[PDB]
């Protein structure tokens, strides 16, 4: 049944892309299944399992967004608030008329894909917007980076503390980390670059917010499951998850939430791949706001891509169907291949 379709999509994928290790998790009706291939380390030949820890890159962005949503559920913040409101050092002009919403949906006005502490603050102070806030989407790590920081500020605690001592335990995730603890170190997969060379993500400002989470398929498919079915979560988390799956604007058939991107389901794999493409990340796109932001409706696909130097993560699920797939690899292989494989598995389910 499922095990054979997953095997016949991932094995050829892994051979084609020369991936050392791949774990896949699917969920249906609250029930998870794990399909594990290859090795976490090419030297040790440590096998991949659903407890293997991977870097998930920009999928971290959904965790950041849930953190911000938890701050809003607890009255610490409004999405319309100006960013300067939460950081004195940014007061003076610019960030007085850029909203938190703007920062979180990448519409702050031209913040770049990546950074060229307070020296990152200084980056922001010297930054010259290319466009009016709210007019164009430009995928940017510093934008969601500051979104998370500010959301942490509002709650009077540092990002890392909030995430690990508050937000993740309350999601039931005990194998999701910003910093991989010493006892779990051996579970941390080795990442390999385009050439097969080992590499782990390198620290950076507000990395924790943008691309700094690592987790296993077991914890990430659970994350996916409570994002689909939040009714057992405490109320502020429920409200938070509603906030992240709210659509605030459209950009080419894709409707933007907080961290999560959303599409009609079903969708052609071709429509799904072009929505996750290289230029839909690197090119600026004008945005049709939703004058009344739209609560999550049925027949929607939720997905997220995320990459590091040596890792390739992808998440896709359709909440109204209760269907979710997670694929974690210790290779940054192309996005198109990730959605193709996810799409196949979801269909078969």
With strands numbered from the N-terminus, the spatial order across the biggest sheet is 2-1-14-13-12-9-8-7-11
Radius of gyration (Å)? 19 Å
The CATH architecture can be given as 3-Layer(aba) Sandwich
Structural domains: how many: 1
Output the number of helix runs: 12
Subcellular location: Periplasm
EC number: 3.5.2.6
Pfam families: Beta-lactamase (PF00144)
Enzyme class: hydrolase
Task: Explain briefly what this protein structure is.
This is Beta-lactamase. The chain is an alpha+beta fold.
Task: Give an account of the 3D structure.
With about 350 residues, the protein is of the alpha+beta class. The chain has a single domain, classed as Beta-lactamase (3-Layer(aba) Sandwich), CATH 3.40.710. About 35% of the residues lie in helices and about 20% in strands. It contains twelve helices and 14 strands. A nine-stranded antiparallel beta sheet has the order 2-1-14-13-12-9-8-7-11, sandwiched between helices. A three-stranded antiparallel beta sheet has the order 3-6-5. It has a two-stranded antiparallel sheet with strand order 4-10. The longest helix has 15 residues, at about 1-15. The N and C termini lie close together (about 10 Å).
List its traits.
cold adaptation; psychrophile; 349 residues; Beta-lactamase; globular; monomer; hydrolase; alpha+beta; 19% strand
